[PDB]
Design a protein around this ligand. Structure first.
Ligand SMILES: NCc1cccc(-c2cccc(C(=O)Nc3ccccc3CC(=O)O)c2)c1
Ligand code: NA
Length: 236
């Protein structure tokens, strides 16, 4: 996250850190708890991943330094990538992880609701992007989970900033005109969480953009509401 601030314990209890374990153990991407054995994340995170055997999902983490050799984690039973996915920039950047066991919900780990059926006309004005990603293009994974409030921009405006790409209604965009706050490497797969009537909803999945926090180049996110039929079908 560029231009963010440190989160505190329990602040974003749906946020998980997905680690790979080979050839070293490291944070790969973010994800969101959406059900008792289900993480929603970005398909592009799994480039070159041979199988789910080399993944671990850690919930209830604030600082990456908390993770020790005896820290509990969930194995991944299945990786479900959208059948139309090809590359992040070309859309369908969405995947589900089915965990090997269930997540017991507490103040530090619980699910986030999807955008509600019937809420098409809701205008989200309180949206936050979170993660352990880089603070700029040439950086490293951050220790403490970062947060930044980012305004949505219309798809019409977003398309004008990305004339070499097809911005579709399966995407949404968020960023400031003068940049300064955005997601960056290591944040993909995590949530764009928006609060409406004091309930948080998973509006976007961090996906891609041109650089990080550059002026007039908003972050591009998977538009979760356009995938509810797909998510519900896979998780039923
Ligand atoms: N501001 C837009 C924005 C939003 C999110 C990520 C980036 C960004 C920047 C530079 C490099 C990368 C990258 O190599 N990613 C990658 C590739 C394969 C697997 C996992 C990942 C991590 C990931 O995507 O987080 C991503 C940019
Ligand atoms: Na769908």
């Amino acid at each position: 996250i560029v231009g963010g601030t440190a989160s505190v314990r329990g602040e974003w209890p749906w946020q998980v850190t997905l680690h790979t374990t080979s050839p070293t153990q490291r944070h790969l991407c973010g994800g969101s708890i959406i059900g008792n054995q289900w993480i929603l994340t970005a398909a592009h995170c799994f480039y070159g991943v041979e199988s789910p055997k080399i993944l671990r999902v850690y919930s209830g983490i604030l600082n990456q330094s908390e993770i020790k050799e005896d820290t509990s984690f969930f194995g991944v039973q299945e990786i479900i990538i959208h059948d139309q996915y090809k590359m992040a920039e070309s859309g369908y950047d969405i995947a589900l992880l089915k965990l090997e066991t269930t997540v017991n919900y507490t103040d530090s780990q619980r699910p986030i609701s999807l955008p509600s059926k019937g809420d098409r006309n809701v205008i989200y004005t309180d949206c936050w992007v979170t993660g352990w990603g880089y603070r700029k293009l040439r950086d490293k994974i951050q220790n403490t989970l970062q947060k930044a409030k980012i305004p949505l921009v219309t798809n019409e405006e977003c398309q004008k900033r990305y004339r070499g790409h097809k911005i579709t209604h399966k995407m949404i965009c968020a960023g400031y005109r003068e940049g300064g706050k955005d997601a960056c490497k290591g944040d993909a797969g995590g949530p764009l969480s928006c609060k409406h009537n004091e309930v948080w909803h998973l509006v976007g999945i961090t996906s891609w953009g041109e650089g990080c926090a550059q002026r007039e180049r908003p972050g591009v996110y998977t538009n979760v509401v356009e995938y509810v039929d797909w998510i519900l079908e896979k998780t039923q």
